[PDB]
Design a protein around this motif. Structure first.
Motif, short mmCIF file in Angstrom:
data_model
loop_
_atom_site.label_atom_id
_atom_site.label_comp_id
_atom_site.label_asym_id
_atom_site.label_seq_id
_atom_site.Cartn_x
_atom_site.Cartn_y
_atom_site.Cartn_z
N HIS A 46 10.29 -1.76 -3.93
CA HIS A 46 8.33 -1.74 -4.15
C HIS A 46 8.52 -0.17 -5.36
CE1 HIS A 46 7.64 -3.62 -0.62
NE2 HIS A 46 8.80 -2.94 0.15
N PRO A 92 0.65 -1.85 0.22
CA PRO A 92 -0.35 -0.09 0.11
C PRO A 92 0.95 1.35 0.28
CG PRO A 92 -1.17 -1.54 1.20
CD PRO A 92 0.11 -2.31 0.73
N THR A 93 2.25 1.44 0.11
CA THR A 93 2.83 2.67 0.42
C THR A 93 3.85 2.03 -0.88
OG1 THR A 93 4.45 1.85 2.00
CG2 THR A 93 2.22 2.77 2.54
N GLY A 136 7.16 -0.35 1.19
CA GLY A 136 6.11 -1.52 1.82
C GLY A 136 4.75 -1.00 2.77
N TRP A 137 4.45 -2.62 2.82
CA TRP A 137 3.21 -3.26 4.13
C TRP A 137 3.78 -1.88 4.93
CZ3 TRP A 137 -0.70 -5.59 1.12
CH2 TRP A 137 0.49 -6.00 0.05
N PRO A 138 2.02 -1.34 5.29
CA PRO A 138 1.78 -1.25 7.02
C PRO A 138 1.67 -2.03 7.57
CG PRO A 138 0.75 0.63 5.56
CD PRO A 138 1.65 -0.58 4.58
N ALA A 139 2.29 -2.03 9.20
CA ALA A 139 1.91 -3.19 9.73
C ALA A 139 0.60 -3.15 10.92
CB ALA A 139 3.22 -2.80 10.97
N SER A 140 -0.02 -1.96 10.28
CA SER A 140 -1.26 -1.47 10.71
C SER A 140 -2.61 -0.61 10.41
CB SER A 140 -1.13 -0.85 13.04
OG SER A 140 -1.08 0.11 12.31
N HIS A 141 -3.62 -1.02 10.92
CA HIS A 141 -4.97 -0.80 10.22
C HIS A 141 -5.18 0.52 10.71
CE1 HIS A 141 -8.69 1.49 10.09
NE2 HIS A 141 -8.46 0.76 8.77
N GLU A 189 -2.34 3.06 9.98
CA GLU A 189 -1.34 3.00 9.63
C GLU A 189 -1.53 3.23 8.23
OE1 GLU A 189 3.48 2.26 8.24
OE2 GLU A 189 3.26 1.27 10.04
N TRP A 190 -2.02 2.44 7.74
CA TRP A 190 -2.00 2.06 6.80
C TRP A 190 -3.89 3.60 6.53
CZ3 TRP A 190 -7.64 0.83 4.68
CH2 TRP A 190 -8.04 0.54 3.53
N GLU A 196 -6.03 0.26 18.49
CA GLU A 196 -5.23 -0.42 17.74
C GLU A 196 -3.67 -1.06 18.93
OE1 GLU A 196 -4.39 -2.16 13.24
OE2 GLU A 196 -4.72 -0.92 13.73
#
Ligand SMILES: [Fe+3]
Ligand SMILES: [Mg+2]
Ligand SMILES: [Mg+2]
Ligand SMILES: [Mn+2]
Ligand SMILES: [Mn+2]
Ligand SMILES: [Mn+2]
Ligand SMILES: [Mn+2]
Ligand SMILES: [Mn+2]
Lengths: 351, 370, 365, 350
Positions: free
Chosen positions: B214, A195-196, A199-204, A206-207, B284
């Protein structure tokens, strides 16, 4: 005729994939039952998290809000303020890799909206969900619904497989323009890359905050690639993606366009102007623009009072509520634009 | 740096200014005295492979004249490859008393950051050679310049070893990373590097980069040069969210990071949205010790170049203060084409006190100048 | 103290998929993680709340006859005892728990919140040992760990890795960096310290598309495509010199098929003859690493058009390093009575069924 | 009589400046003004051992295959070869800016036509296409379809989306309409990690592993329906090995039987489709040149119609172009490989 108060983003929540069966051919309906009906319920608003539904929302037999038109209409229209509401169903058909099944379920989902929502209350409108993994099939889904004027815009997710300005995606813009429909980008995505860019955001959390970065990418792609010159009646609604990020993006993109314009010579108007004239944004979440003076400030920084359009983002829970935006401005004129005039440009809905 | 090693004096900013982004480049063969024989042979036979399918260029090569100002070319080499030219055209001309070198290019045939070489053993050798070179060729002959040392963020073991090797040298003022990484920068993967930097009392600078592993956006590769160049701020946005929300600054409460050439103004509405979202969704991340925007003043800095240009100039100072007025540090990006001049960078109505501390006190605090 | 595994008349089954019944992991999960799951689920590399990006086809990809009176196939330990262990005389059945609940493939180690991922790996290891291994020590555990956070995985291998109910460390076929990367060397170091080999099972996720050139569309592409991740991982683990650094490390590729490895290795050597200059630190010829370091389990058995071709290709890979698996209770389950072609040599079939797995897991009679 | 066709040799672009005579002033001037960044790929790193064997003629810079005169001199010297298919791997497909991709791809095909095809009537070539705009790639194919010295369409083994995706159907349509096979050649757009598990750390690791992507491509091409929608399709796998094909074909067959109703238009077994529609070049041979192994791999493929001769000039491989003869006892098989199997692709007589 007076422009209507339009809630420009509310949600219908598919109860389960079984709700699609009455709208699927027997091949797809039999397949789905044989597959044990895996649910493409998205994780954009995790159903147990604080954002998924506000406490004052009507719920079904399983505690879930916004799974029936009766519950949504009871809540959304209770106080008499709203005239129409635009329904977006985020059920994750765009994440179905099998392109035939993406087509079938998107179509079934729009049938479900039409028969169990739009047919049930004439104050509801809806976006068309499209199978965006096959742009040509997405255009055909726009076309399929283009004669039903209760569908008022085309739904795309904020994160796509390829940037929306790429020629590969031009059939979507062309079909939307031909049908007279704005295109909305709504938070969410197909997740076919990180999504960035890092790399992959580790929490909803952050996303969710960071998907604004992708909307900058999409707008820069759409404009640079020439969508607004090739399809000059295009209207874009950013739904539930914030908007305070827009000015600093607009300024940088204007600055660099002054140097790189021969690289994109069809863009003879500044992006600033193109964005003010072609892009609209819903107001839920307000991301702090509801604080004192901050809505006047962001309108000043945008350089336009025509872009903000009202939404509640029902049933979602945000730090401030649908009409707390009034705290951020001293202008009744601005509030009248946000509550009704701005949306008239999108939908031409009268009281 | 948590014990200093060397007799070179610490920097002094009295009447001059700080320049937080200067790009020197080694002349051809200038790194070879510092490279093992095995790597010189490797480079001759394979170049410096990175995240592209290209032998010599990055995936978005520069457009107009390599994106250098047309007046910064020496007799012979690339812009930034002449030490005297850089001293007269930049350090003397603008009275820069702390100029921080940001070497992200080994030089000659190869312009990608050393750290991004897919062969990470080669990457570590290039980073080390760079640091030996810039300390001997530039910093120690003219200690107005100080080094932000590139390390291999994608192999923390090698980066820790480099930080221990030269991180206490008074010619070194920062650790130098890239804006794009394979994992967001708050990931545990990079914590051993933050630990080593903290142990040396070094802050970290992350400079604009391509590469990383990426696409250059979170939703596909860009086509046109407006998309590429504007798109750089997105990586910084993502890195800020990760570094804060990960609790990296809970673990490392003295860690200082600067985003270099990622613009400034966009951080303020980003942080604003972060706080607003966190108000609802904080449950969270129950271990996160502070409200997200409170990490900014103690932990997150940004450089000026290229200066944000709002349509109404009064909006610049507002957004800089909404970010954090103490944490904005001046930079020229000599010798790139969008080079900022300290005499003309700021808009006519800019507050003088904010301007003064951007040119002086804010950078002095970041780099530990006292 | 649990006895060492013993294989005599029976067989080794290197891939069995048990599932915890609803709530079975809660006694081993901290309270902070339960609430997190109730609210967020187990977020991973998708935009989907409850399923992975390639949900199974027909009947959840499970044997039609393997469903208990209630619950999901693999969740009833009596049915697993009679329908698998008793029915095929399995004396070392290696458990690979791929899901913390009634799912078919949603690995704990791939939760994007890696503190959650380590917690779920921990609970899974406590659960499978009390619920399955100690009551019936014909089963033993390949313990899932968080390969993408090596600190957590080293801790878990230190916590439970020496338990005689554990016979391997369990990772996934897909990863963010290829498995010869230095990132994972601490895990290889910790495993070698506990005398554990490592099993990498077929997975989705990992951080990239499921091929190196785009996401697949149809089921034939997805399922056949699993082979590709394993080809990439073998090439990295060999060429990186990982087995130079860890000369006693054993790794098994589980449910990546077998026969394709043989032409891959042949191409590897052939290319390396010309291009070995690029990797001068590598101490052996690439194919020489296979014998001491690379194992593969058999299911789903390769089915050449001419049956003879199976034994040839298995031997061209390495006949000593092929280990039997059933993949109970998945739909493409292999029956040891019927998986091998008629002309198959008995020596090869016997050590696939016994000796080969015995040596991989460090088992004696 | 079917001609001996060298089904994969290479032209190497000297520099981007070689395109200036074939670019409109806008692109020519710009090229010069960007300082002419070269899109020379790293698929065969110029200083590595694969880039050129030691017997190949070189130019003033030490580079092989940068002129038709040098290539022709080497390839045809012993009289065995009648025609050679030229592939230029210059990295236009890695130009992100879509219009520049289109412009440079067109200019490269012009360069091939004017400086290679026009200089020796034994040369044929593939059409380089801007793959990032499938519509434009189709137009490029149409444009060169009138020059029958272009005998196939060049696609890289690693693409942006799988080649079976509907987005890419305009390329297969245009190729079929021009009666041209489509070749996949080792190389890539590198718009994701080249493997499903991340970025290979060395050229050697990358080069060996690209076979995995060709499994992805063929499964996508067949499952998506290319061979039924465009039934005259012909696919050549160039310089991607071939020994990996049987274990892929068997698994694909087995799962096609499990998953028939998912892809109902695929009514033939992928085994037969691949044997009928897919051909493969023999350089590199990846160990099939050793004693008995060429008969063995043809047995495993279940067809003697798939392999077509190539030298992969000027590249250096562990065995040479004719070393495949040591792997078979069958003159009939060698006649298929050297002459007859390629007649299905190009219809070239002596
Ligand atoms: Fe399995
Ligand atoms: Mg204002
Ligand atoms: Mg050696
Ligand atoms: Mn919404
Ligand atoms: Mn800079
Ligand atoms: Mn710059
Ligand atoms: Mn299975
Ligand atoms: Mn070739």
């Amino acid at each position: 005729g007076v422009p209507a108060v339009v809630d420009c983003d509310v949600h219908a929540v598919l109860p389960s994939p079984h709700s699609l069966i009455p709208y699927l051919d027997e091949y797809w309906a039999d397949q789905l039952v044989a597959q044990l009906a895996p649910t493409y319920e998205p994780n954009y608003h995790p159903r147990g998290s604080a954002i998924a539904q506000h406490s004052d929302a009507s719920v079904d037999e399983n505690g879930r809000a916004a799974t029936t038109a009766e519950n949504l209409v009871k809540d959304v229209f209770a106080d008499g303020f709203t005239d129409f509401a635009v329904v977006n169903c985020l059920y994750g058909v765009q994440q179905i890799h099998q392109p035939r099944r993406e087509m079938a379920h998107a179509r079934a989902l729009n049938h479900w909206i039409a028969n169990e929502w739009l047919d049930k209350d004439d104050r509801l409108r809806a976006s068309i969900v499209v199978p965006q993994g096959s742009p040509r099939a997405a255009a055909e889904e726009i076309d399929f619904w283009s004669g039903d004027k209760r569908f008022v815009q085309v739904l795309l997710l904020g994160q796509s497989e390829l940037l929306y300005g790429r020629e590969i995606n031009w059939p979507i813009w062309e079909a939307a323009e031909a049908a007279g429909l704005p295109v909305t980008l709504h938070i969410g995505g197909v997740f076919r890359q990180a999504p960035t860019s890092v790399g992959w955001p580790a929490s909803h959390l952050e996303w969710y905050v960071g998907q604004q970065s992708n909307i900058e990418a999409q707008l820069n792609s759409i404009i640079s690639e020439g969508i607004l010159q090739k399809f000059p009646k295009t209207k874009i609604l950013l739904s539930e993606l914030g908007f305070n990020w827009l000015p600093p993006f607009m300024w940088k993109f204007d600055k660099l366009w002054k140097s790189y314009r021969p690289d994109i010579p069809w863009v003879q108007e500044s992006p600033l102007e193109l964005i003010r004239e072609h892009v609209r944004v819903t107001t839920s979440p307000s991301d702090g623009a509801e604080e004192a003076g901050r809505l006047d400030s962001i309108v000043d920084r945008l350089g336009s009072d025509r872009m903000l359009v009202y939404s509640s983002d029902y049933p979602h829970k945000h730090h401030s509520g649908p009409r707390d935006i009034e705290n951020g401005t001293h202008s009744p004129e601005l509030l009248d634009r946000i509550y009704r005039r701005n949306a008239f440009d999108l939908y031409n809905l009268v009281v | 740096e948590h014990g200093s090693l060397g007799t070179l004096p610490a920097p002094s900013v009295t009447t001059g200014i700080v320049d937080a982004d200067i790009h020197p480049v080694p002349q051809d063969g200038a790194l070879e005295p510092y490279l093992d024989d095995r790597w010189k042979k490797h480079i001759r036979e394979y170049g410096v492979r990175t995240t592209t399918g290209l032998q010599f260029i990055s995936e978005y090569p520069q457009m107009y004249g390599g994106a250098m100002r047309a007046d910064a070319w020496p007799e012979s080499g690339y812009p930034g490859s002449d030490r005297e030219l850089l001293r007269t055209q930049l350090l003397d001309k603008h009275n820069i008393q702390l100029g921080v070198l940001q070497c992200l290019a080994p030089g000659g045939q190869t312009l990608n950051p050393a750290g991004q070489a897919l062969n990470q053993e080669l990457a570590a050798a290039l980073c080390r050679a760079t640091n030996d070179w810039q300390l001997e060729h530039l910093v120690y002959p003219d200690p107005r310049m100080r080094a932000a040392i590139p390390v291999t963020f994608e192999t923390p073991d090698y980066a820790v070893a480099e930080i221990e090797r030269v991180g206490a040298d008074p010619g070194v003022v920062a650790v130098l990373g890239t804006s794009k990484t394979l994992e967001p920068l708050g990931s545990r993967k990079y914590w051993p590097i933050y630990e080593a930097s903290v142990a040396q009392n070094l802050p970290i600078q992350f400079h604009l980069s391509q590469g990383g592993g990426h696409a250059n956006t979170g939703t596909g590769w860009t086509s046109y040069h407006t998309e590429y160049h504007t798109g750089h701020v997105q990586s910084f946005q993502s890195q800020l969210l990760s570094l804060v929300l990960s609790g990296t600054f809970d673990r490392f409460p003295t860690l200082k990071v600067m985003f270099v050439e990622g613009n400034v103004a966009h951080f303020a509405p980003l942080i604003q949205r972060m706080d607003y979202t966190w108000e609802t969704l904080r449950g969270e991340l129950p271990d996160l010790q502070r409200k997200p925007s409170e990490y900014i003043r103690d932990h997150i800095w940004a450089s000026t170049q290229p200066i944000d240009e709002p349509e109404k100039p009064e909006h610049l100072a507002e957004l800089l203060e909404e970010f954090c007025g103490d944490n904005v540090v001046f930079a020229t990006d000599y010798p790139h084409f969008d080079f900022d001049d300290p005499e003309t960078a700021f808009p006519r109505s800019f507050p003088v006190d904010l301007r003064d501390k951007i040119l002086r006190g804010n950078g002095m605090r970041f780099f530990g100048v006292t």
